[PDB]
Amino acid sequence: QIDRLITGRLQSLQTYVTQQLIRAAEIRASANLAATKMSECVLGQSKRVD
């Protein structure tokens, strides 16, 4: 019984961690965009349309 419970809970934890990894990657992409926008659009004037 204990083994079966361990397996189930372990699978749940695996799923959660993987979901977190993917979401963190997307957030990092957005943060890189924000940094680029701030550097090229506040510290100077940009000529890139829209």
Added chain:
Amino acid sequence: DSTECSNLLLQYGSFCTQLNRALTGIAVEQDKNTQEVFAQVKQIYKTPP
């Protein structure tokens, strides 16, 4: 179409719920992608004859 199997599956919890949620997220992100790429013009212009 197996009631006993559904009863067994109920014991695992919310695994299938997480999966449906994720696939719906992807399915809406796709339409977000196409609108962002194409819907950049406010009006519909037309070339003269």
